[PDB]
Amino acid sequence: ATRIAILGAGPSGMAQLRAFQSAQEKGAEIPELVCFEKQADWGGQWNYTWRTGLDENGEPVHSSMYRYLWSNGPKECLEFADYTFDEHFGKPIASYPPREVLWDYIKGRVEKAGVRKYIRFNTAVRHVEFNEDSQTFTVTVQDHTTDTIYSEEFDYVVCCTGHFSTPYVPEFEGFEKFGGRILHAHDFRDALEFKDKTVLLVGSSSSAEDIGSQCYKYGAKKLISCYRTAPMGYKWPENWDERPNLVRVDTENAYFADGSSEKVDAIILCTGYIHHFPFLNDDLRLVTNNRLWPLNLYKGVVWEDNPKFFYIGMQDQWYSFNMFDAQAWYARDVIMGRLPLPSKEEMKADSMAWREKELTLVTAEEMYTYQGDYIQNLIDMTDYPSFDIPATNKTFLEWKHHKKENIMTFRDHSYRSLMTGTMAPKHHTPWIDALDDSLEAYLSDK
Amino acid sequence: TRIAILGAGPSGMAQLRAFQSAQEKGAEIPELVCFEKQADWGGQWNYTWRTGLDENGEPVHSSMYRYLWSNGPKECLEFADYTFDEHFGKPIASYPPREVLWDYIKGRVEKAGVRKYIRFNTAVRHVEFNEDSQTFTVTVQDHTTDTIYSEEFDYVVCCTGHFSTPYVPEFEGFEKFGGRILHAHDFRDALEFKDKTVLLVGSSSSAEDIGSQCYKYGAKKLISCYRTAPMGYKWPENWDERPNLVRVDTENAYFADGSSEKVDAIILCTGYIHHFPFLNDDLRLVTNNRLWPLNLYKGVVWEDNPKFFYIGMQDQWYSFNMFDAQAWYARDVIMGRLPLPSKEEMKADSMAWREKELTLVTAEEMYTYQGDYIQNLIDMTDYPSFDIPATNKTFLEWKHHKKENIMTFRDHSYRSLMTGTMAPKHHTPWIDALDDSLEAYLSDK
Ligand SMILES: Cc1cc2nc3c(=O)[nH]c(=O)nc-3n(C[C@H](O)[C@H](O)[C@H](O)COP(=O)(O)OP(=O)(O)OC[C@H]3O[C@@H](n4cnc5c(N)ncnc54)[C@H](O)[C@@H]3O)c2cc1C
Numbered sequence: 088a089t090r091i092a093i094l095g096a097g098p099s100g101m102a103q104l105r106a107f108q109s110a111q112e113k114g115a116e117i118p119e120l121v122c123f124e125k126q127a128d129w130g131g132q133w134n135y136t137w138r139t140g141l142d143e144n145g146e147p148v149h150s151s152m153y154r155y156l157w158s159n160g161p162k163e164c165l166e167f168a169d170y171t172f173d174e175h176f177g178k179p180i181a182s183y184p185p186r187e188v189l190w191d192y193i194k195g196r197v198e199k200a201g202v203r204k205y206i207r208f209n210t211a212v213r214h215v216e217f218n219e220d221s222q223t224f225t226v227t228v229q230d231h232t233t234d235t236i237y238s239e240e241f242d243y244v245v246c247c248t249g250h251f252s253t254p255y256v257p258e259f260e261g262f263e264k265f266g267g268r269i270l271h272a273h274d275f276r277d278a279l280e281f282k283d284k285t286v287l288l289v290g291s292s293s294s295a296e297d298i299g300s301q302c303y304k305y306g307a308k309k310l311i312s313c314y315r316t317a318p319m320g321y322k323w324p325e326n327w328d329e330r331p332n333l334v335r336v337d338t339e340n341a342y343f344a345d346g347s348s349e350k351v352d353a354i355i356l357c358t359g360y361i362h363h364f365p366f367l368n369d370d371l372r373l374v375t376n377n378r379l380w381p382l383n384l385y386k387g388v389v390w391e392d393n394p395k396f397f398y399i400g401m402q403d404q405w406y407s408f409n410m411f412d413a414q415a416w417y418a419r420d421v422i423m424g425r426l427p428l429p430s431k432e433e434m435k436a437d438s439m440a441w442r443e444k445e446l447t448l449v450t451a452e453e454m455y456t457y458q459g460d461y462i463q464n465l466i467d468m469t470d471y472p473s474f475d476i477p478a479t480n481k482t483f484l485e486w487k488h489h490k491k492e493n494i495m496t497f498r499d500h501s502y503r504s505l506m507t508g509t510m511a512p513k514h515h516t517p518w519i520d521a522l523d524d525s526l527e528a529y530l531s532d533k
Numbered sequence: 534t535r536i537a538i539l540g541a542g543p544s545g546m547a548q549l550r551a552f553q554s555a556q557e558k559g560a561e562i563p564e565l566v567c568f569e570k571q572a573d574w575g576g577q578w579n580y581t582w583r584t585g586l587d588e589n590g591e592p593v594h595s596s597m598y599r600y601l602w603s604n605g606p607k608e609c610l611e612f613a614d615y616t617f618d619e620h621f622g623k624p625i626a627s628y629p630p631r632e633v634l635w636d637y638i639k640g641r642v643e644k645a646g647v648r649k650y651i652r653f654n655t656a657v658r659h660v661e662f663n664e665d666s667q668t669f670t671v672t673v674q675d676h677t678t679d680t681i682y683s684e685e686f687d688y689v690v691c692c693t694g695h696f697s698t699p700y701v702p703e704f705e706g707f708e709k710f711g712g713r714i715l716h717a718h719d720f721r722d723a724l725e726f727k728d729k730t731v732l733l734v735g736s737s738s739s740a741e742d743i744g745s746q747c748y749k750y751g752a753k754k755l756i757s758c759y760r761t762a763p764m765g766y767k768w769p770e771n772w773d774e775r776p777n778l779v780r781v782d783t784e785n786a787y788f789a790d791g792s793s794e795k796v797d798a799i800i801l802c803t804g805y806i807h808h809f810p811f812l813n814d815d816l817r818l819v820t821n822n823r824l825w826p827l828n829l830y831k832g833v834v835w836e837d838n839p840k841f842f843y844i845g846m847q848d849q850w851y852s853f854n855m856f857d858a859q860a861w862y863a864r865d866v867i868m869g870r871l872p873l874p875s876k877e878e879m880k881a882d883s884m885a886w887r888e889k890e891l892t893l894v895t896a897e898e899m900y901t902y903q904g905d906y907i908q909n910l911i912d913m914t915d916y917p918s919f920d921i922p923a924t925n926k927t928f929l930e931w932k933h934h935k936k937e938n939i940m941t942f943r944d945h946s947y948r949s950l951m952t953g954t955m956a957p958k959h960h961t962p963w964i965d966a967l968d969d970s971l972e973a974y975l976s977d978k
């Protein structure tokens with residue numbers, strides 16, 4: 088019998104299981120499924136934890152998610168094609184819900200799917216080895232409930248371990264002497280810790296502007312954004328300055344490429360992440376910068392040096408959940424034989440075509456349209472329910488318009504569901520005043 | 534014949550030094566490869582501002598913080614082959630700051646010429662034993678080149694430490710607590726807690742010293758809670774002693790009293806686990822922190838596989854001298870200088886050490902035991918003997934001084950067990966000595 092190892096029970100791992108399960112509901116015979124997850128519960132990034140650095144078992148803490156996090160884009164842009172917001176909540180909700188709400192929603196689908204049973208929680212994957220003699224993988228894991236290390240054999244391996252958890256943490260001169268907190272976006276947890284403080288935000292990611300927004304929204308004295316990249320275009324609040332790149336700091340102050348100086352209390356490095364898989368050797372290890380099209384991934388999923396090994400969600404994410412679904416539905420169908428693979432040379436070449444296309448992209452719009460086209464190519468091949476991608480692209484377009492209008496009020500906008508045509512209403516509380524991030528307070532009429 | 538040494542901390546340096554001191558005397562040593570994940574040696578002593586994961590994605594190793602000073606008297610760890618007098622050339626006080634002790638440790642290891650064996654910025658991924666080969670496969674990631682490579686070795690000596698991977702227990706409410714929660718492992722700079730109420734959970738040397746560090750640098754209040762036995766230390770006025778924590782809310786802690794108090798930050802000083810993600814269970818040491826872990830014959834030899842070794846995996850009352858003793862022994866086992874008893878015999882010997890370990894109650898007995906342990910390992914090798922009883926005496930002097938006044942024990946002096954000279958009082962009292970640099974400590978300030 089065929090056995091599949093699914094590494095991670097985040098949205099990608101949840102999608103992979105949901106993919107096989109939906110096919111089983113259709114009457115098809117599926118392979119055995121084993122999903123390994125180092126946390127105690129599913130949700131991946133979305134499973135909030137107070138912990139930082141290393142976890143209860145000594146494993147690097149996975150979630151980079153913080154308190155007061157709300158949907159970064161329109162919820163309409165991440166809605167499942169097979170499990171609507173209407174089906175789960177039973178009513179309309181605003182367009183940018185808090186983390187817990189989007190956690191509830193993603194848990195809802197897999198709970199209904201009945202896939203929890205395939206997952207071995209509290210279990211860290213240690214090593215994945217491809218045996219040439221038998222054409223199978225040995226997957227070595229550490230079960231922290233039993234405190235035992237074991238391995239099993241698998242025919243296919245789908246890696247869903249994410250790529251926003253191992254931080255890229257560059258050093259600047261003076262860091263050793265600095266009297267205040269220095270952390271990466273990854274350790275950022277509670278904006279209250281920075282109340283009445285001057286927080287330096289180093290680098291230019293999407294989290295940079297959001298972490299800043301949370302610190303602003305919860306009473307930080309001042310916010311300083313410094314970055315070597317192009318102006319973001321966003322007009323910030325009164326107590327929010329921009330600077331060119333950081334050069335050094337001392338016991339108290341930050342010094343800039345500007346020639347300028349300033350007192351800062353905490354430094355938050357929003358410098359991004361690295362694709363890090365310490366459980367893989369180089370034959371299987373994906374190595375790439377964070378981008379829309381990494382190489383060595385046929386259809387962005389199939390590992391070209393070993394087409395029995397797969398990666399979900401390893402691309403940078405304009406689209407998220409339904410990309411993972413599209414990806415997992417494709418991976419399923421390749422595993423199940425429903426879609427035979429071309430030659431390695433043919434795969435390599437198809438991948439190069441997607442790569443050259445990527446290098447020609449010069450606008451935000453070209454980028455998510457590109458990824459939207461990649462998703463279209465994926466769902467065309469399988470029985471994943473198709474949805475209006477071009478209309479998703481317009482919703483994204485609207486979202487970037489709303490960001491440019493006012494960077495602090497973009498979450499007060501509402502959008503039309505592309506799955507059901509349901510119009511999201513204005514939330515009861517405007518973002519800047521919605522200090523309570525609970526699912527209970529959000530779904531309330533109060 | 535090849536040896537892999539995992540870690541370039543004091544234990545890995547001890548193991549490298551052992552082989553270089555067989556060579557220096559006139560022997561034919563095996564090939565040495567020392568893998569180190571940091572960019573430099575020192576282990577705990579290589580201080581970093583970093584927390585959680587390092588620049589490469591590896592767990593930050595060091596648990597050491599700004600303004601850290603020698604835990605005990607420097608006399609108790611003085612190297613026989615390399616005295617404090619030789620290194621510095623002048624007399625110094627008995628509790629030097631990290632930087633000064635680091636200059637000292639660095640000193641001896643540089644004059645040993647062993648750096649050439651160490652591949653830095655290299656993290657050990659996996660170690661496997663091949664029955665058919667009777668040799669170990671050590672897979673590694675080299676972060677300078679981003680390359681993962683396997684190499685074969687005849688013996689492995691694991692020196693990856695056990696004070697870096699935290700035991701981090703959760704309390705009810707932690708999720709909603711509005712202040713910082715960090716482990717002792719993440720503690721870096723006491724300045725961050727100026728004018729703040731800090732809760733310290735758990736009992737250890739570091740709990741005491743982290744609190745002291747916060748107190749010295751201007752914390753508004755400190756609160757110590759634990760389940761273990763109190764020492765009855767005479768704490769300051771703004772230092773509070775409470776029974777175990779039960780709960781926290783947005784800003785308040787709740788104790789077994791039923792009493793509550795607002796706290797700005799919580800520092801979990803709850804110890805560490807022996808964590809070896811590079812090993813399978815065939816090789817992997819499983820133990821709580823104690824004087825006598827099992828499956829370690831003479832505390833060093835892995836009993837299920839005699840060709841695999843652990844250094845410094847015991848709880849540390851003695852430190853550097855223990856590693857040296859353990860390193861010397863392991864070297865002589867590796868070099869065929871000492872034959873091993875059968876698995877049945879090794880386990881008998883280890884059982885007796887464990888029975889004696891469970892009888893130990895007092896500080897005095899703990900030192901004696903580990904003292905006696907090191908003596909046993911020293912007698913089997915060409916390692917120079919030292920005055921263990923006098924070291925214990927000096928250790929006990931220090932614990933008595935802690936009990937007199939926890940805030941002043943570092944101002945006391947002790948007699949060098951190498952020169953017999955009484956160390957001079959330091960130019961600045963500890964509570965006023967805010968500058969922790971080597972330069973400030975060595976000058977006439
Ligand atoms: C700060 C932040 C904010 C974000 N906000 C949004 C947003 O607002 N909207 C949006 O659409 N997307 C957002 N994202 C993007 C996010 O990546 C996706 O929403 C989604 O979480 C990706 O799912 P994933 O399963 O592919 O990866 P992850 O969510 O990271 O899941 C990886 C899983 O694998 C597990 N794992 C990793 N290593 C091992 C191991 N060795 N052994 C066992 N298990 C392992 C982890 O525990 C985890 O469960 C955000 C990301 C970050 C970092």
Ligand SMILES: Cc1cc2nc3c(=O)[nH]c(=O)nc-3n(C[C@H](O)[C@H](O)[C@H](O)COP(=O)(O)OP(=O)(O)OC[C@H]3O[C@@H](n4cnc5c(N)ncnc54)[C@H](O)[C@@H]3O)c2cc1C
Pocket residue numbers: 539540541542543544545568569570571574575576577578594596597602603604605610655656657658692693694695696697739811844845849851852853856
């Ligand atoms: C906070 C603190 C304060 C202390 N103060 C004192 C003191 O004042 N006096 C005293 O005598 N002792 C003190 N100690 C005891 C201390 O453990 C020893 O001094 C000494 O550092 C132990 O050395 P070690 O080499 O066995 O382990 P470590 O010093 O912990 O070093 C282990 C080395 O292995 C490396 N490593 C681990 N895993 C890997 C991997 N997978 N791949 C590659 N490399 C790896 C690490 O980088 C590290 O360098 C203190 C300990 C702590 C935690």
